Amino acid sequence: VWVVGMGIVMSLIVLAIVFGNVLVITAIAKFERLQTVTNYFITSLACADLVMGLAVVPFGAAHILMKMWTFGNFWCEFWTSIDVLCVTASIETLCVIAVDRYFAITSPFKYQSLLTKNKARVIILMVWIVSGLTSFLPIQMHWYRATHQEAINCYAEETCCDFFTNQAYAIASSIVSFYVPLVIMVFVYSRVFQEAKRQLNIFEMLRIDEGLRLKIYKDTEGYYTIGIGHLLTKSPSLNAAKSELDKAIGRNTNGVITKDEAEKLFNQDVDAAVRGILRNAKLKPVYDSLDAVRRAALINMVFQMGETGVAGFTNSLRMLQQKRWDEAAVNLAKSRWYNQTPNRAKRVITTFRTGTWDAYKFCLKEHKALKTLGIIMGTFTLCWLPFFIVNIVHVIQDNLIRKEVYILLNWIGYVNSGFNPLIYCRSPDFRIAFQELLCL
Protein backbone atom coordinates (compact mmCIF):
# COMPACT_ATOMS: atom_id res chain seq x y z
CA VAL A 1 0.00 0.00 0.00
CA TRP A 2 1.01 3.69 0.09
CA VAL A 3 2.74 3.38 3.49
CA VAL A 4 6.16 2.58 1.98
CA GLY A 5 6.44 6.24 0.96
CA MET A 6 6.00 7.63 4.47
CA GLY A 7 8.35 4.97 5.86
CA ILE A 8 11.21 6.24 3.71
CA VAL A 9 10.22 9.86 4.42
CA MET A 10 10.15 9.27 8.18
CA SER A 11 13.33 7.16 8.09
CA LEU A 12 15.13 10.04 6.35
CA ILE A 13 13.78 12.47 8.95
CA VAL A 14 15.17 10.25 11.72
CA LEU A 15 18.57 10.28 10.00
CA ALA A 16 18.57 14.03 9.32
CA ILE A 17 17.82 14.53 13.02
CA VAL A 18 20.36 12.06 14.43
CA PHE A 19 23.20 12.50 11.93
CA GLY A 20 22.77 16.28 11.97
CA ASN A 21 22.63 16.73 15.75
CA VAL A 22 25.46 14.29 16.43
CA LEU A 23 27.38 16.35 13.86
CA VAL A 24 26.60 19.54 15.80
CA ILE A 25 27.46 17.84 19.09
CA THR A 26 30.75 16.36 17.86
CA ALA A 27 31.83 19.66 16.28
CA ILE A 28 31.54 21.38 19.66
CA ALA A 29 33.17 18.42 21.45
CA LYS A 30 36.42 18.18 19.48
CA PHE A 31 36.97 21.76 18.28
CA GLU A 32 38.17 24.24 20.90
CA ARG A 33 37.00 27.54 19.42
CA LEU A 34 33.42 26.23 19.29
CA GLN A 35 33.54 25.36 23.02
CA THR A 36 31.83 28.61 23.96
CA VAL A 37 29.16 29.27 26.58
CA THR A 38 26.47 29.68 23.91
CA ASN A 39 27.48 26.40 22.28
CA TYR A 40 27.12 24.49 25.54
CA PHE A 41 23.51 25.66 25.36
CA ILE A 42 23.44 24.46 21.75
CA THR A 43 24.91 21.13 22.91
CA SER A 44 21.93 20.47 25.17
CA LEU A 45 19.65 21.88 22.47
CA ALA A 46 21.11 19.33 20.05
CA CYS A 47 20.74 16.62 22.70
CA ALA A 48 17.05 17.50 23.09
CA ASP A 49 16.80 17.17 19.31
CA LEU A 50 19.03 14.07 19.23
CA VAL A 51 16.94 12.21 21.80
CA MET A 52 13.91 13.40 19.82
CA GLY A 53 15.28 11.39 16.89
CA LEU A 54 16.51 8.34 18.78
CA ALA A 55 13.67 7.73 21.27
CA VAL A 56 10.65 9.72 20.03
CA VAL A 57 10.35 10.01 16.23
CA PRO A 58 11.06 6.32 15.42
CA PHE A 59 8.49 4.98 17.88
CA GLY A 60 6.03 7.57 16.58
CA ALA A 61 6.75 6.35 13.06
CA ALA A 62 6.02 2.75 14.08
CA HIS A 63 2.84 4.07 15.72
CA ILE A 64 1.62 5.72 12.51
CA LEU A 65 2.60 3.00 10.05
CA MET A 66 1.32 0.07 12.13
CA LYS A 67 -1.75 2.10 13.27
CA MET A 68 -1.25 0.72 16.80
CA TRP A 69 1.29 0.55 19.63
CA THR A 70 3.72 -2.39 19.64
CA PHE A 71 5.80 -1.49 22.67
CA GLY A 72 3.51 -1.69 25.72
CA ASN A 73 2.05 0.81 28.16
CA PHE A 74 5.40 1.15 29.94
CA TRP A 75 7.20 2.44 26.86
CA CYS A 76 4.03 4.32 25.92
CA GLU A 77 4.60 6.37 29.09
CA PHE A 78 8.32 7.02 28.56
CA TRP A 79 7.83 7.68 24.84
CA THR A 80 5.26 10.30 25.82
CA SER A 81 7.34 11.36 28.83
CA ILE A 82 10.58 11.68 26.85
CA ASP A 83 8.74 13.49 24.04
CA VAL A 84 7.46 16.08 26.52
CA LEU A 85 10.92 16.23 28.12
CA CYS A 86 12.68 17.04 24.84
CA VAL A 87 10.23 19.82 23.94
CA THR A 88 10.26 21.38 27.41
CA ALA A 89 14.06 21.30 27.62
CA SER A 90 14.35 22.79 24.11
CA ILE A 91 12.30 25.94 24.74
CA GLU A 92 13.93 26.60 28.11
CA THR A 93 17.34 26.17 26.49
CA LEU A 94 16.32 28.64 23.78
CA CYS A 95 15.00 30.76 26.64
CA VAL A 96 18.32 30.55 28.50
CA ILE A 97 20.17 31.43 25.28
CA ALA A 98 18.04 34.54 24.75
CA VAL A 99 18.49 35.68 28.36
CA ASP A 100 22.19 34.83 28.21
CA ARG A 101 22.50 36.93 25.05
CA TYR A 102 20.61 39.78 26.71
CA PHE A 103 22.89 40.01 29.75
CA ALA A 104 25.84 39.68 27.35
CA ILE A 105 24.78 42.46 24.96
CA THR A 106 24.13 44.86 27.87
CA SER A 107 27.45 44.34 29.67
CA PRO A 108 30.60 46.22 28.61
CA PHE A 109 31.83 42.74 27.64
CA LYS A 110 29.61 42.99 24.58
CA TYR A 111 28.74 39.69 22.84
CA GLN A 112 30.35 37.60 25.62
CA SER A 113 28.33 35.53 28.08
CA LEU A 114 28.53 36.57 31.72
CA LEU A 115 28.25 32.91 32.78
CA THR A 116 31.36 30.81 33.13
CA LYS A 117 31.45 27.33 31.62
CA ASN A 118 31.25 25.50 34.95
CA LYS A 119 28.26 27.68 35.87
CA ALA A 120 26.65 27.21 32.45
CA ARG A 121 26.94 23.46 33.01
CA VAL A 122 25.07 23.99 36.29
CA ILE A 123 22.33 25.76 34.31
CA ILE A 124 22.04 22.90 31.79
CA LEU A 125 21.41 20.31 34.50
CA MET A 126 18.75 22.42 36.23
CA VAL A 127 17.00 22.90 32.88
CA TRP A 128 16.86 19.14 32.37
CA ILE A 129 16.03 18.61 36.07
CA VAL A 130 13.14 21.08 36.00
CA SER A 131 12.10 19.73 32.60
CA GLY A 132 12.42 16.16 33.85
CA LEU A 133 10.14 16.95 36.79
CA THR A 134 7.49 18.84 34.81
CA SER A 135 7.54 16.11 32.13
CA PHE A 136 7.88 12.73 33.85
CA LEU A 137 5.87 13.42 37.02
CA PRO A 138 2.55 14.42 35.37
CA ILE A 139 2.81 11.40 33.06
CA GLN A 140 4.08 8.88 35.62
CA MET A 141 1.60 10.07 38.29
CA HIS A 142 -1.30 9.85 35.78
CA TRP A 143 -2.24 13.51 36.37
CA TYR A 144 -2.94 13.79 32.63
CA ARG A 145 -5.42 10.88 32.51
CA ALA A 146 -8.79 11.96 31.16
CA THR A 147 -12.04 10.65 32.63
CA HIS A 148 -14.06 10.12 29.44
CA GLN A 149 -14.77 6.63 28.16
CA GLU A 150 -12.68 6.69 24.97
CA ALA A 151 -9.54 7.69 26.89
CA ILE A 152 -10.14 5.08 29.61
CA ASN A 153 -10.41 2.30 27.03
CA CYS A 154 -7.10 3.38 25.49
CA TYR A 155 -5.46 3.56 28.94
CA ALA A 156 -6.14 -0.06 29.91
CA GLU A 157 -5.49 -1.24 26.35
CA GLU A 158 -1.80 -1.98 25.89
CA THR A 159 -1.98 -1.78 22.08
CA CYS A 160 -3.31 1.80 22.30
CA CYS A 161 -0.98 4.73 23.00
CA ASP A 162 -3.28 7.60 22.07
CA PHE A 163 -2.41 10.75 24.00
CA PHE A 164 -5.61 11.93 25.68
CA THR A 165 -5.32 14.40 28.55
CA ASN A 166 -7.83 16.14 30.78
CA GLN A 167 -8.41 19.83 30.15
CA ALA A 168 -6.47 20.90 33.25
CA TYR A 169 -3.27 19.22 32.04
CA ALA A 170 -3.60 20.52 28.47
CA ILE A 171 -3.79 24.06 29.86
CA ALA A 172 -1.20 23.89 32.64
CA SER A 173 1.28 21.90 30.53
CA SER A 174 1.06 24.24 27.54
CA ILE A 175 1.28 27.37 29.70
CA VAL A 176 4.03 26.39 32.14
CA SER A 177 6.19 24.31 29.80
CA PHE A 178 5.73 26.06 26.43
CA TYR A 179 4.01 29.46 26.46
CA VAL A 180 5.82 31.01 29.45
CA PRO A 181 9.37 30.34 28.12
CA LEU A 182 8.18 31.18 24.59
CA VAL A 183 6.80 34.59 25.57
CA ILE A 184 9.95 35.22 27.60
CA MET A 185 12.14 34.06 24.70
CA VAL A 186 10.39 36.20 22.10
CA PHE A 187 10.32 39.28 24.34
CA VAL A 188 13.86 38.98 25.75
CA TYR A 189 15.49 38.16 22.41
CA SER A 190 13.63 40.89 20.53
CA ARG A 191 15.23 43.04 23.23
CA VAL A 192 18.64 41.77 22.05
CA PHE A 193 18.19 42.70 18.38
CA GLN A 194 17.10 46.14 19.59
CA GLU A 195 20.30 46.61 21.61
CA ALA A 196 22.61 45.42 18.82
CA LYS A 197 21.05 48.02 16.51
CA ARG A 198 21.02 50.76 19.15
CA GLN A 199 24.61 50.00 20.21
CA LEU A 200 26.32 50.70 16.90
CA ASN A 201 29.18 53.17 17.33
CA ILE A 202 31.83 54.30 14.84
CA PHE A 203 34.13 51.43 15.84
CA GLU A 204 31.77 48.63 14.83
CA MET A 205 30.72 50.72 11.81
CA LEU A 206 34.28 50.98 10.48
CA ARG A 207 35.27 47.42 11.42
CA ILE A 208 32.35 46.18 9.30
CA ASP A 209 32.97 48.09 6.07
CA GLU A 210 36.74 48.53 6.48
CA GLY A 211 37.47 44.90 7.36
CA LEU A 212 40.26 43.46 9.48
CA ARG A 213 43.46 41.87 8.19
CA LEU A 214 46.54 41.03 10.25
CA LYS A 215 48.84 40.90 7.19
CA ILE A 216 49.98 43.89 5.12
CA TYR A 217 47.77 44.21 2.04
CA LYS A 218 46.97 46.67 -0.73
CA ASP A 219 43.78 48.68 -0.25
CA THR A 220 41.35 49.70 -3.00
CA GLU A 221 43.82 52.39 -4.12
CA GLY A 222 46.76 49.97 -4.00
CA TYR A 223 48.43 51.59 -0.98
CA TYR A 224 49.98 49.36 1.66
CA THR A 225 47.61 49.08 4.63
CA ILE A 226 47.32 46.81 7.68
CA GLY A 227 44.95 46.24 10.59
CA ILE A 228 41.57 47.89 10.14
CA GLY A 229 42.35 50.09 7.14
CA HIS A 230 45.41 51.64 8.78
CA LEU A 231 47.33 53.33 5.97
CA LEU A 232 51.02 52.46 6.27
CA THR A 233 52.51 54.47 3.38
CA LYS A 234 51.85 55.58 -0.19
CA SER A 235 55.28 54.46 -1.45
CA PRO A 236 55.32 51.18 -3.43
CA SER A 237 58.11 49.81 -1.21
CA LEU A 238 57.06 46.93 1.04
CA ASN A 239 59.84 47.56 3.57
CA ALA A 240 58.85 51.23 3.60
CA ALA A 241 55.44 49.98 4.73
CA LYS A 242 57.07 47.47 7.09
CA SER A 243 59.52 50.02 8.51
CA GLU A 244 56.71 52.55 9.04
CA LEU A 245 54.71 49.73 10.64
CA ASP A 246 57.52 48.98 13.11
CA LYS A 247 58.01 52.67 13.94
CA ALA A 248 54.31 53.07 14.77
CA ILE A 249 54.11 49.85 16.79
CA GLY A 250 57.61 49.92 18.30
CA ARG A 251 58.02 46.18 17.60
CA ASN A 252 59.75 44.40 14.73
CA THR A 253 56.69 42.73 13.20
CA ASN A 254 57.85 41.61 9.71
CA GLY A 255 54.43 42.72 8.46
CA VAL A 256 52.25 40.70 10.88
CA ILE A 257 50.58 42.04 14.05
CA THR A 258 48.16 40.73 16.65
CA LYS A 259 44.55 41.83 17.06
CA ASP A 260 45.32 43.70 20.29
CA GLU A 261 47.88 46.07 18.76
CA ALA A 262 45.60 46.32 15.70
CA GLU A 263 42.70 47.74 17.71
CA LYS A 264 45.14 50.19 19.32
CA LEU A 265 46.00 51.47 15.85
CA PHE A 266 42.28 51.48 15.00
CA ASN A 267 41.61 53.68 18.04
CA GLN A 268 44.41 56.11 17.17
CA ASP A 269 43.10 56.39 13.60
CA VAL A 270 39.57 57.16 14.80
CA ASP A 271 41.04 59.64 17.29
CA ALA A 272 42.96 61.31 14.46
CA ALA A 273 39.71 61.48 12.48
CA VAL A 274 37.75 63.18 15.27
CA ARG A 275 40.65 65.52 16.07
CA GLY A 276 40.91 66.26 12.35
CA ILE A 277 37.21 67.08 12.04
CA LEU A 278 37.66 69.54 14.91
CA ARG A 279 40.86 71.12 13.56
CA ASN A 280 39.38 71.76 10.11
CA ALA A 281 37.14 74.83 10.14
CA LYS A 282 35.02 73.52 7.25
CA LEU A 283 34.15 70.24 9.01
CA LYS A 284 33.76 71.53 12.59
CA PRO A 285 30.30 73.20 12.37
CA VAL A 286 28.79 70.36 10.32
CA TYR A 287 29.95 67.72 12.80
CA ASP A 288 28.32 69.68 15.63
CA SER A 289 25.03 69.99 13.71
CA LEU A 290 24.61 66.21 13.53
CA ASP A 291 23.26 63.40 15.68
CA ALA A 292 25.41 60.51 16.88
CA VAL A 293 24.51 58.30 13.90
CA ARG A 294 25.57 60.93 11.36
CA ARG A 295 28.55 62.00 13.45
CA ALA A 296 29.79 58.43 12.97
CA ALA A 297 29.04 58.48 9.24
CA LEU A 298 31.14 61.67 9.05
CA ILE A 299 34.00 60.16 11.08
CA ASN A 300 33.88 57.28 8.58
CA MET A 301 34.41 59.59 5.59
CA VAL A 302 37.39 61.30 7.25
CA PHE A 303 38.72 57.86 8.25
CA GLN A 304 38.85 56.76 4.59
CA MET A 305 39.76 59.97 2.76
CA GLY A 306 41.30 62.45 5.23
CA GLU A 307 40.33 65.89 6.45
CA THR A 308 41.08 67.87 3.29
CA GLY A 309 39.43 65.32 1.00
CA VAL A 310 36.15 65.34 2.93
CA ALA A 311 36.11 69.15 3.09
CA GLY A 312 35.84 69.28 -0.71
CA PHE A 313 32.14 68.31 -0.54
CA THR A 314 31.26 71.96 -0.02
CA ASN A 315 27.60 71.56 -0.98
CA SER A 316 27.04 68.32 0.94
CA LEU A 317 28.59 69.91 4.03
CA ARG A 318 26.21 72.89 3.93
CA MET A 319 23.19 70.60 3.53
CA LEU A 320 24.05 68.17 6.33
CA GLN A 321 24.31 71.22 8.58
CA GLN A 322 20.99 72.49 7.19
CA LYS A 323 19.68 68.99 8.06
CA ARG A 324 18.51 68.49 4.45
CA TRP A 325 19.39 64.82 4.42
CA ASP A 326 17.88 63.56 1.15
CA GLU A 327 19.39 66.50 -0.74
CA ALA A 328 22.84 65.96 0.78
CA ALA A 329 22.57 62.24 -0.02
CA VAL A 330 22.30 63.08 -3.74
CA ASN A 331 25.42 65.23 -3.95
CA LEU A 332 27.17 62.51 -1.94
CA ALA A 333 26.21 60.16 -4.78
CA LYS A 334 27.37 62.63 -7.48
CA SER A 335 30.93 62.27 -6.14
CA ARG A 336 33.75 59.99 -7.25
CA TRP A 337 33.92 58.54 -3.73
CA TYR A 338 30.65 56.75 -4.47
CA ASN A 339 32.31 55.67 -7.73
CA GLN A 340 35.48 54.04 -6.37
CA THR A 341 33.88 52.31 -3.35
CA PRO A 342 30.10 52.27 -3.93
CA ASN A 343 29.19 49.59 -1.38
CA ARG A 344 30.86 51.56 1.41
CA ALA A 345 29.58 54.94 0.22
CA LYS A 346 26.06 53.50 -0.03
CA ARG A 347 26.15 52.47 3.63
CA VAL A 348 27.56 55.86 4.67
CA ILE A 349 25.24 57.96 2.49
CA THR A 350 22.24 55.97 3.70
CA THR A 351 23.45 56.53 7.27
CA PHE A 352 23.40 60.29 6.64
CA ARG A 353 20.14 60.05 4.71
CA THR A 354 18.16 57.93 7.18
CA GLY A 355 19.93 58.74 10.44
CA THR A 356 19.71 55.07 11.43
CA TRP A 357 21.85 51.92 11.21
CA ASP A 358 19.70 50.09 8.65
CA ALA A 359 22.58 50.00 6.15
CA TYR A 360 24.66 48.04 8.70
CA LYS A 361 22.02 45.55 9.88
CA PHE A 362 23.57 42.15 10.60
CA CYS A 363 26.82 43.14 8.89
CA LEU A 364 29.04 42.64 11.94
CA LYS A 365 30.26 39.11 12.68
CA GLU A 366 28.75 39.07 16.17
CA HIS A 367 25.40 40.37 14.88
CA LYS A 368 25.32 37.56 12.32
CA ALA A 369 25.87 35.14 15.20
CA LEU A 370 22.86 36.64 17.00
CA LYS A 371 20.73 36.51 13.85
CA THR A 372 21.64 32.82 13.65
CA LEU A 373 20.34 32.30 17.19
CA GLY A 374 17.24 34.29 16.23
CA ILE A 375 16.50 31.84 13.41
CA ILE A 376 16.64 28.67 15.51
CA MET A 377 14.20 30.43 17.85
CA GLY A 378 11.88 31.73 15.12
CA THR A 379 11.90 28.29 13.53
CA PHE A 380 11.17 26.60 16.87
CA THR A 381 8.18 28.93 17.20
CA LEU A 382 6.77 28.30 13.72
CA CYS A 383 7.12 24.52 14.15
CA TRP A 384 5.44 24.20 17.57
CA LEU A 385 3.17 27.24 17.88
CA PRO A 386 0.60 25.79 15.41
CA PHE A 387 0.57 22.57 17.44
CA PHE A 388 0.19 24.41 20.75
CA ILE A 389 -2.41 26.89 19.48
CA VAL A 390 -4.51 23.94 18.32
CA ASN A 391 -4.21 22.29 21.75
CA ILE A 392 -5.35 25.48 23.48
CA VAL A 393 -8.33 25.87 21.12
CA HIS A 394 -9.22 22.16 21.23
CA VAL A 395 -9.82 22.61 24.96
CA ILE A 396 -11.77 25.87 24.73
CA GLN A 397 -13.90 24.77 21.77
CA ASP A 398 -14.66 21.52 23.71
CA ASN A 399 -14.72 19.44 20.50
CA LEU A 400 -12.30 16.51 20.46
CA ILE A 401 -9.25 16.96 18.27
CA ARG A 402 -8.87 15.40 14.83
CA LYS A 403 -6.42 12.55 15.39
CA GLU A 404 -4.75 13.06 12.01
CA VAL A 405 -4.86 16.86 12.24
CA TYR A 406 -3.46 16.60 15.78
CA ILE A 407 -0.61 14.21 14.98
CA LEU A 408 0.13 16.22 11.82
CA LEU A 409 0.95 19.43 13.69
CA ASN A 410 3.02 17.43 16.18
CA TRP A 411 5.18 16.26 13.25
CA ILE A 412 5.79 19.83 12.11
CA GLY A 413 7.25 20.03 15.60
CA TYR A 414 9.16 16.77 15.09
CA VAL A 415 10.94 18.03 11.96
CA ASN A 416 12.32 20.87 14.06
CA SER A 417 15.01 18.52 15.37
CA GLY A 418 16.56 18.42 11.89
CA PHE A 419 16.51 22.18 11.26
CA ASN A 420 19.16 23.29 13.76
CA PRO A 421 22.21 21.77 11.95
CA LEU A 422 21.36 23.62 8.72
CA ILE A 423 21.00 26.94 10.55
CA TYR A 424 24.44 26.20 12.01
CA CYS A 425 25.84 25.71 8.50
CA ARG A 426 24.92 29.39 8.25
CA SER A 427 27.74 30.10 10.77
CA PRO A 428 31.28 30.21 9.31
CA ASP A 429 32.83 28.35 12.25
CA PHE A 430 30.42 25.40 12.03
CA ARG A 431 30.97 25.04 8.27
CA ILE A 432 34.72 24.76 8.84
CA ALA A 433 34.00 22.34 11.70
CA PHE A 434 31.47 20.22 9.80
CA GLN A 435 33.74 19.86 6.76
CA GLU A 436 36.55 18.45 8.92
CA LEU A 437 34.23 15.90 10.53
CA LEU A 438 32.79 14.99 7.12
CA CYS A 439 36.34 14.92 5.68
CA LEU A 440 35.36 16.90 2.59
Ligand X SMILES: CC(C)CCC[C@@H](C)[C@H]1CC[C@H]2[C@@H]3CC=C4C[C@@H](O)CC[C@]4(C)[C@H]3CC[C@]12C
Ligand Y SMILES: Nc1nc(Nc2ccccc2)nc2ccc(Br)cc12
Ligand Z SMILES: C=CCc1ccccc1OC[C@@H](O)CNC(C)C
- Binding residues (CB under 6 A) for ligand X: these are 25, 29, 40, 43-44, 47, 50-51, 54-55, 82, 85, 121, 124-125, 128
Report DSSP state, residue 291. Answer: -
Does the annotation list 88 as a binding residue? yes
Binding-site partner at residue 24 among ligand X, ligand Z, ligand Y, none, CB < 5 to 8 Å by type: none
- Asked if 184 touches ligand Y (CB under 6 A), the answer is yes
Catalytic residue among 77, 219, 261, 429: 219
210 is catalytic: yes
Distances (CA, A) of 285 to 279, 311, 318: 11, 12, 9
Binding-site partner at residue 204 among ligand Y, ligand X, ligand Z, none, CB < 5 to 8 Å by type: none
**CB contact at 8 A, 351 and 293:** yes
Q: Which of 157, 156, 138 is nearest to 81 (CA)?
A: 138
Which residues from 318-357 bind ligand Y, rule CB under 6 A? none
- Asked if 84 touches ligand Z (CB under 6 A), the answer is yes
326 is catalytic: no
- Asked if 163 touches ligand Z (CB under 6 A), the answer is yes
Q: How far is the CB of 73 from ligand Z (least distance, A)?
A: 14
Q: Which of 412, 440, 425 is nearest to 24 (CA)?
A: 425
CB nearer ligand Z, residue 91 or residue 311: 91
Q: How far is the CB of 78 from ligand X (least distance, A)?
A: 8
Does the annotation list 391 as a binding residue? yes
Distances (CA, A) of 96 to 120, 135, 240, 283, 380: 10, 18, 52, 47, 14
**CB contact at 8 A, 89 and 128:** yes
**CB contact at 8 A, 171 and 181:** no
C-alpha–C-alpha distance, residues 33 and 31, integer Å: 6
Per DSSP bridges, beta strands 224-227 and 230-233 are: antiparallel
- Asked if 94 touches ligand Z (CB under 6 A), the answer is no
- Asked if 181 touches ligand Y (CB under 6 A), the answer is yes
Active site residues: 210, 219
Annotated binding-site positions for (S)-carazolol: 83, 173, 410
Query: Residues interacting with ligand Z, by CB under 6 A?
Result: 80, 83-84, 87-88, 163, 165, 170, 173-174, 177-178, 391, 410, 413
